[PDB]
Amino acid sequence: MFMINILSLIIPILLAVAFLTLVERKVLGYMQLRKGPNVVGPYGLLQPIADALKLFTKEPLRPATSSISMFIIAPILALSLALTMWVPLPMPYPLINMNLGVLFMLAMSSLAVYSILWSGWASNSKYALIGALRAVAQTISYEVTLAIILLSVLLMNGSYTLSTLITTQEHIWMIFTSWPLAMMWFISTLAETNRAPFDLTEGESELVSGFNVEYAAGPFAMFFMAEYANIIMMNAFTAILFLGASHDPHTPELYTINFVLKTLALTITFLWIRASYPRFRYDQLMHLLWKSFLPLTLALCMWHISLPIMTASIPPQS
Amino acid sequence: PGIVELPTLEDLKVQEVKVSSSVLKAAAHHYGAQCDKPNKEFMLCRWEEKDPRRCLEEGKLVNQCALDFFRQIKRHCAEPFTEYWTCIDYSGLQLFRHCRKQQAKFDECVLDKL
Amino acid sequence: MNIMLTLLTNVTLASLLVLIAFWLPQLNAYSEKTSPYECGFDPMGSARLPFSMKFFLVAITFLLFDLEIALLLPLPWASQTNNLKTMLTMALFLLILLAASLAYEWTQKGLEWAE
Amino acid sequence: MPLVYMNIIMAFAIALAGLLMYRSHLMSSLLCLEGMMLSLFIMSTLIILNTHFTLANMMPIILLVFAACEAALGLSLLVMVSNTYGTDYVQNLNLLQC
Amino acid sequence: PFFDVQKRLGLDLDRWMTIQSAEQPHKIPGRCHAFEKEWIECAHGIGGIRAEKECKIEFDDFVECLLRQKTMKRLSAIKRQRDKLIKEGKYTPPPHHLGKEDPRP
Amino acid sequence: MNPIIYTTLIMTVMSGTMLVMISSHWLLIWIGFEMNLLAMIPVLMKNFNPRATEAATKYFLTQATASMMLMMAIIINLLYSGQWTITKMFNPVAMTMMTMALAMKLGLSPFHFWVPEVTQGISLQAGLLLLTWQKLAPLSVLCQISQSINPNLMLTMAMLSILIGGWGGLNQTQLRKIMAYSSIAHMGWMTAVLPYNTTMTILNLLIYITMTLAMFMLLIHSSATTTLSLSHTWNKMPVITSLMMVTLLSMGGLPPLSGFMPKWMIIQEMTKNESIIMPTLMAMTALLNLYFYMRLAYSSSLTMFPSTNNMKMKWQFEHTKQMKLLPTMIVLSTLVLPMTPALSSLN
Amino acid sequence: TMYIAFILSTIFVIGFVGFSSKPSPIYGGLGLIVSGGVGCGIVLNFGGSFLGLMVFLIYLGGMLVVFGYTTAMATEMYPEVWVSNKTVFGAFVSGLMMEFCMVYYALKEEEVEIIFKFNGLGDWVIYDTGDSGFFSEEAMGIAALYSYGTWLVIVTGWSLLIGVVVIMEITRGN
Amino acid sequence: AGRIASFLKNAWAKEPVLVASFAIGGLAIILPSLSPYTNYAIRINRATPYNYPVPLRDDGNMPDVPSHPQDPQGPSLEWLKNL
Amino acid sequence: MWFEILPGIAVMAACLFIPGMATAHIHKFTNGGKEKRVAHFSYQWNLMERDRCISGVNRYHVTKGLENID
Ligand SMILES: CCCCCCCCCCCCCCCCCC(=O)OC[C@H](COP(=O)([O-])OCC[N+](C)(C)C)OC(=O)CCCCCCCCCCCCCCCCC
Ligand SMILES: CCCCCCCCCCCCCCCCC[C@@H](O)O[C@H](CO[C@H](O)CCCCCCCCCCCCCCC)COP(=O)(O)OCC[N+](C)(C)C
Numbered sequence A: 001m002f003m004i005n006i007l008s009l010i011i012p013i014l015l016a017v018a019f020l021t022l023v024e025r026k027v028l029g030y031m032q033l034r035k036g037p038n039v040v041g042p043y044g045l046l047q048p049i050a051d052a053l054k055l056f057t058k059e060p061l062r063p064a065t066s067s068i069s070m071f072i073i074a075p076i077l078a079l080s081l082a083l084t085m086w087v088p089l090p091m092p093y094p095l096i097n098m099n100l101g102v103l104f105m106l107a108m109s110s111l112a113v114y115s116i117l118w119s120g121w122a123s124n125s126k127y128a129l130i131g132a133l134r135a136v137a138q139t140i141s142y143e144v145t146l147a148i149i150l151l152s153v154l155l156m157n158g159s160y161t162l163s164t165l166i167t168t169q170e171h172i173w174m175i176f177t178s179w180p181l182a183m184m185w186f187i188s189t190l191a192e193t194n195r196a197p198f199d200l201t202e203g204e205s206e207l208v209s210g211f212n213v214e215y216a217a218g219p220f221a222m223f224f225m226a227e228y229a230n231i232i233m234m235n236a237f238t239a240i241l242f243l244g245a246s247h248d249p250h251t252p253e254l255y256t257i258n259f260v261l262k263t264l265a266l267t268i269t270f271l272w273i274r275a276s277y278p279r280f281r282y283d284q285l286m287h288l289l290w291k292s293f294l295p296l297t298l299a300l301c302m303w304h305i306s307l308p309i310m311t312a313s314i315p316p317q318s
Numbered sequence B: 001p002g003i004v005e006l007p008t009l010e011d012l013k014v015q016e017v018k019v020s021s022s023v024l025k026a027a028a029h030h031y032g033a034q035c036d037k038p039n040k041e042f043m044l045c046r047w048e049e050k051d052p053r054r055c056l057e058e059g060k061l062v063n064q065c066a067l068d069f070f071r072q073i074k075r076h077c078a079e080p081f082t083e084y085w086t087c088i089d090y091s092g093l094q095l096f097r098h099c100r101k102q103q104a105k106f107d108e109c110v111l112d113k114l
Numbered sequence C: 001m002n003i004m005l006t007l008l009t010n011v012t013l014a015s016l017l018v019l020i021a022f023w024l025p026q027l028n029a030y031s032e033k034t035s036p037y038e039c040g041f042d043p044m045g046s047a048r049l050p051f052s053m054k055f056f057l058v059a060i061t062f063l064l065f066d067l068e069i070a071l072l073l074p075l076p077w078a079s080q081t082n083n084l085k086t087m088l089t090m091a092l093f094l095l096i097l098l099a100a101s102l103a104y105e106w107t108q109k110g111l112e113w114a115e
Numbered sequence D: 001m002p003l004v005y006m007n008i009i010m011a012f013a014i015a016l017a018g019l020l021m022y023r024s025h026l027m028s029s030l031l032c033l034e035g036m037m038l039s040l041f042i043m044s045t046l047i048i049l050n051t052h053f054t055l056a057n058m059m060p061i062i063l064l065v066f067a068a069c070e071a072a073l074g075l076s077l078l079v080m081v082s083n084t085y086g087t088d089y090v091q092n093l094n095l096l097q098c
Numbered sequence E: 001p002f003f004d005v006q007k008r009l010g011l012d013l014d015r016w017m018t019i020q021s022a023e024q025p026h027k028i029p030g031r032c033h034a035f036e037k038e039w040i041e042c043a044h045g046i047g048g049i050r051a052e053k054e055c056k057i058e059f060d061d062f063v064e065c066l067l068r069q070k071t072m073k074r075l076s077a078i079k080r081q082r083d084k085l086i087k088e089g090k091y092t093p094p095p096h097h098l099g100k101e102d103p104r105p
Numbered sequence F: 001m002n003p004i005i006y007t008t009l010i011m012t013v014m015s016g017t018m019l020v021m022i023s024s025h026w027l028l029i030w031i032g033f034e035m036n037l038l039a040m041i042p043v044l045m046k047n048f049n050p051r052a053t054e055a056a057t058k059y060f061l062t063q064a065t066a067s068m069m070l071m072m073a074i075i076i077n078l079l080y081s082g083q084w085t086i087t088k089m090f091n092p093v094a095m096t097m098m099t100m101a102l103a104m105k106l107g108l109s110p111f112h113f114w115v116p117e118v119t120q121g122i123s124l125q126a127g128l129l130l131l132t133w134q135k136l137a138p139l140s141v142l143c144q145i146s147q148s149i150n151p152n153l154m155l156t157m158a159m160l161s162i163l164i165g166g167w168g169g170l171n172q173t174q175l176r177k178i179m180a181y182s183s184i185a186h187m188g189w190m191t192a193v194l195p196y197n198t199t200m201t202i203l204n205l206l207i208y209i210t211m212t213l214a215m216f217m218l219l220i221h222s223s224a225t226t227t228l229s230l231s232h233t234w235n236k237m238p239v240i241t242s243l244m245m246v247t248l249l250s251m252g253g254l255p256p257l258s259g260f261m262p263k264w265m266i267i268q269e270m271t272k273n274e275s276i277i278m279p280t281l282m283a284m285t286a287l288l289n290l291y292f293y294m295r296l297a298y299s300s301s302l303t304m305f306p307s308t309n310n311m312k313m314k315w316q317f318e319h320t321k322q323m324k325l326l327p328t329m330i331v332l333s334t335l336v337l338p339m340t341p342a343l344s345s346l347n
Numbered sequence G: 001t002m003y004i005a006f007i008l009s010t011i012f013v014i015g016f017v018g019f020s021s022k023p024s025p026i027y028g029g030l031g032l033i034v035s036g037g038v039g040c041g042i043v044l045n046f047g048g049s050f051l052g053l054m055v056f057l058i059y060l061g062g063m064l065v066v067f068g069y070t071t072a073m074a075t076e077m078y079p080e081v082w083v084s085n086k087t088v089f090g091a092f093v094s095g096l097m098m099e100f101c102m103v104y105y106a107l108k109e110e111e112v113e114i115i116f117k118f119n120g121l122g123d124w125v126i127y128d129t130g131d132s133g134f135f136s137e138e139a140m141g142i143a144a145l146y147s148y149g150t151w152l153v154i155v156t157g158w159s160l161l162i163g164v165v166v167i168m169e170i171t172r173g174n
Numbered sequence H: 001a002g003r004i005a006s007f008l009k010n011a012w013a014k015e016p017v018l019v020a021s022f023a024i025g026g027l028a029i030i031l032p033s034l035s036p037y038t039n040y041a042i043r044i045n046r047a048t049p050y051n052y053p054v055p056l057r058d059d060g061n062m063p064d065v066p067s068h069p070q071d072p073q074g075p076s077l078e079w080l081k082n083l
Numbered sequence I: 001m002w003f004e005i006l007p008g009i010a011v012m013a014a015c016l017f018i019p020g021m022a023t024a025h026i027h028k029f030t031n032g033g034k035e036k037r038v039a040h041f042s043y044q045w046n047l048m049e050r051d052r053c054i055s056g057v058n059r060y061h062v063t064k065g066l067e068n069i070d
């Protein structure tokens, strides 16, 4: 039954990724006064299926200058880690119940970094190399800021267990408790997922498709699936971390509905931000976190260390 | 450097407490209040002797006290206790927080009958 | 065990997708198609040449700050101790020293990129 | 001793032999130096977790801290050498003689 | 060489961490707390030479608890003899060792 | 480098050494070693040039390898004993690893090449600090763990150091390389006496440090880094050359100077332990060190080399900066033989 | 048994053999990342989940900087892979053969090395029967860095600040 | 006070992020030493029974040690109940 | 119009319902109609093992009670 649970976690995630592609198309179109895909299917519902079939029936090519082994491994690593990030999430019951559920996600994100780096280096082209090094800088900044922000927010929780996060947010929301950390965490998650205004690893205007310039057909679709799965997973993590849903042990489907609605709201906010804002420069992104977020993050970390002690509100250990 | 001396299998036998963790957790505060004497004697023996083989009789007395406590519960408050531990067993963490009504009925039954 | 099974499932699914990608479609490769892309013109040099890194100091500072976050991570458990005053003093000491490192680098212009 | 300790000690020995045998790059030897500390971390935590030395669980973290301090030092020296010579080759570090 | 500033000033900088039988958080005992305590109390105040000469029994028990070499030798000998016996069909394991029993709670 | 940064780096080097010398925990001793190296690298790279950068790189590589081996020895010792206190090590393999690591940190042969290379690479102040302090710390660790030292390995490395220092100093013309090979030979003598009397090790350390400080400060005063550069000092300030000559005579072990006291006491102590061949070989081999000290003395003070014409302007000008404790170091390095029995106070 | 820890240890040694044969810093970093993940797995099986996750995260962050530095400082026209060069392939094969010989001898008999004696038996055998309760011993010992270990925190923070100062001074130039 | 006011006005117009960061840090350093609930947090951390309360052997001269858990002698968490 | 976006969002939401509800149903199916036991600590794991031992069917979720003690 555990393999059945793994399949029930994997396949709906991929379907939701495809329909998130469709939803982003239509939302951006309507914000841009267009309609978006509404021809392929009823209200454009077969567009993701058509795109997937076209991509996986199109010819893939390995560049003559490429290192083939790491050229093939990178999409595998990206999609594998994108699917693996979902296993500790409680909705309201995690597939894999971990005692340290957050450090696992941090480590797996830091590992998912290397997919774009190795695809850019393996492609053996200048645009791919530029995209890879932009990824390096972006990962530096967002990694330090994300680590400290998560430390503080979970210090308000008592442990690194997301079910314990639910129990903590039984009454009120971590957005009510710690909204500045929530704002900075949202920005850092945008940077982590490489979304606008921080879509610099693959910046179409500056680089011709960035790190995945040489990727085509099936391998490219895997990078796209990994990116969108990471978007949804990070928005789900944000919803669990800051917008705690009320949980009924005897009817857990209500938590699932609330969590899905909050995650969809956050993902649509991601698409809204992409439609709204221009693109950063990566030096300005590094200077944004290091020179603005990092001092405030350290001050808020000190404040959230002190606050439970001075108010006698330290959370239970277990 | 010597032969390790072990109790035989015949004097390790005792009447077991064959209730589950949920049943034990439901009647846990009442058990700790009612059978405090043998349990504390056994724990003192275990921490002083530092040897399992030296406190077997105390363990058997602990088992006897637990069996007597559960028989007293069974003779008077079988139904409220069954409802209480059935509520406790459902929770994955076996939380006392979700069963404050069945716990109230069980406490009322044991306070009046016993 | 369960985590190993999940990892194996994910890697197997990704590898199967790659295998379907590289074998299902019709293949037709020649020298011009597989040549490197530089917007229509042949690259002058090679992509394996050195690529100057203008934020080299920030990467080393990032290594040190990663150490700092590793030190700071066990704080949720450290707040369960009876020596709350000592624990609070040490946590604030570590964070103040990290802030001092950041301020020193900022004032000495280590956060600025090379020109 | 179990074979896990044997494997970790063999890994340390391999990483030490790698550092003592340069090829061309200083970066490769820096990577070999980083691996030795990884093996030390693994060995120390395996020993401490097996003996339940509770207060010793903080030692591997300090080990990692000074590990990355050494890595930072090596990277700084490598950038200075690369600025001086154009490559991180250890053959260029031959101005001083014994 | 060794300037015992800790002993002179009454400070405790690393003596808390030197041994595993000292004060541990939540009174968590070490794996070989009893053996280390016995060896330390034997060797206290007599110096290194006399400690090695005379507390060798305590030190050997301590090292045996730490590494479990003699115990592993005994277990391996028993396993090898049992495997040889079952190879020729001269030994039949009991059902409670084969998994056909109800263990104790 | 800002003066505040330089003094804080010196304070951090001294803090690392003091942490090593006061800690009772192997982890804290390793931490002190790491802090010392981390703050010592920029001191080597203070005056930036390719030679200084190369010297710092070689020093960092050597010390990092030694630290890795030292931590491996600590872990192996912990595995077989469960002890973190610095005492007699419980595993011979861990003791051998620790001995090799500390010998590499000191520069004992065959781990010596980095000593002349780095000493030539770095300036005179950096070389002085390097030699003195970076010999000060690992010798403290060795004195603490002496009772588990393998006499064969320690004496082998010590005799190798003596021979190699003598021969290298014979060949060199550069003053910094000469000082480095002298350091190698003196470290050989000290580690040779180490497995018998840590008090004699400390006595030799003190006398060597005094003589090395006097010699390095004299070189800084004369601003001479080569033999021919030192050959011009007699025409500007002949007193410094005479003081350098008597210091060189002392460093060669000639009675009745201070340099004879460590050799004499070490030979006596090793003889008390029924060692004759080793003291005789060590005494005979030091004649190479004496020879190249005498060759340096011939060029600087006992003969007059040709000079140049701008030395007249140099005559017209006067030395500004004052060396601190230079007369005291010169007196202590030549005239403390009658005060030998103070080693009991050193005990 | 299932020999999970032994298999992971073998993979750890294989990754060490790779990045020690030193094809090029890209593949050396790849091998070191693999070794870090496998060591995380080993110590997770032995009990320390926080320590495993921390070492994996720290080395993942550290190898990111190494990649950027080898792209700039330690790159050549044709970066070397294990089969590209005869020396690298020879070192890789030597390490693999030595590891395989040690594993075979250890599994077949109680292999006593010239340095240490290793017994071929269960890593599950060497474990302890006792158990903790309602807390993690590793987590409590690590969190004791602040109540205990005030001195360690002081020296560690001072070392990190001095390291920042040092890396600023080394790369100053002029 | 005029120089301090001018500096604060200039910083609040140029670096509000840094002004807020320093204010939050200063309040994090100072407030715990003044709040009367720090000792309450210490007591709550002490009152948590992680391990078993091993009983003491009664010598007949232990008047402050309860014989039963519900006896009046011993620590009381009535303060924590109403908190 | 903007409500033509909803069917895609509806499909995505329906897809996201499947993982959590499926996990809850599988946990209740494989734990005898009850929540899957959470064992974050050795005490909880030992409770589960004792439940397996006393059940007599090698399933911890098979709970026994007063009818079992007598
Ligand atoms: C390495 C992975 C191992 C595990 C694989 C697990 C299952 C994988 C499932 C995904 C499959 C992805 C492809 C989907 C189908 C579309 C492509 C396709 O049909 O490819 C097949 C390929 C197709 O060949 P192709 O190269 O022309 O592929 C292009 C196909 N079109 C035209 C559709 C684009 O078939 C072969 O390569 C073999 C054809 C017959 C020749 C047989 C030669 C002998 C060796 C194999 C037979 C067995 C020998 C036994 C004896 C051995 C000892 C002597
Ligand atoms: C001041 C001397 C200057 C000259 C020497 C300089 C040496 C470096 C500076 C050393 C200063 C610190 C020395 C004292 C260390 C105190 C260690 C410990 O004993 O005190 C702690 C008390 O700590 C205090 O809270 C203050 C600690 C110091 C705060 C930081 C000041 C040091 C700043 C150092 C700056 C960096 C310079 C260091 C490198 C040169 C313990 O409190 P306690 O709670 O009972 O411990 C609980 C243990 N239990 C559980 C077993 C009971």
Ligand SMILES: CCCCCCCC/C=C/CCCCCCCC(=O)OC[C@H](COP(=O)(O)OCCN)OC(=O)CCCCCCC/C=C/CCCCCCCC
Pocket (backbone or CB within 6 Å): A175, A180, A181, A182, A183, A184, A186, A187, A197, A238, A242, A273, A277, A292, A293, A296, A303, H014, H015, H017, H020, H024
């Ligand atoms: C959880 C969901 C959260 C939802 C929130 C979403 C917000 C809207 C999303 C749209 C934004 C996404 C794209 C924008 C990306 C860029 C964002 C951005 O620029 O913000 C950074 C912004 C830009 O700085 P500069 O203009 O460059 O000035 C530099 C001066 N030298 O600066 C910042 O860092 C803002 C940081 C916000 C942190 C919150 C401020 C804290 C307020 C202090 C009061 C709290 C004190 C706590 C103590 C209480 C004591 C009782």
Ligand SMILES: CCCCCCCC/C=C\CCCCCCCC(=O)O[C@H](COC(=O)CCCCCCC/C=C/CCCCCCCC)COP(=O)(O)OCCN
Pocket (backbone or CB within 6 Å): A294, A295, A296, A298, A299, C096, C099, C100, C102, C103, C106, C107, H011, H014, H015, H018, H019, H020, H021, H022, H023, H024, H025, H026, H029
């Ligand atoms: C001390 C207790 C707090 C502990 C630490 C605080 C948390 C961490 C904060 C430190 C992080 C680093 C700070 C770095 C400070 C100097 C950096 C710097 O160089 O700033 C300069 C100098 O600018 C300044 O104005 C210095 C900041 C002065 C702010 C300090 C004010 C102190 C406030 C005390 C409390 C006041 C309360 C007011 C409350 C108002 C409402 C909240 C500007 O940078 P630029 O180079 O111009 O930017 C790039 C341009 N191309």
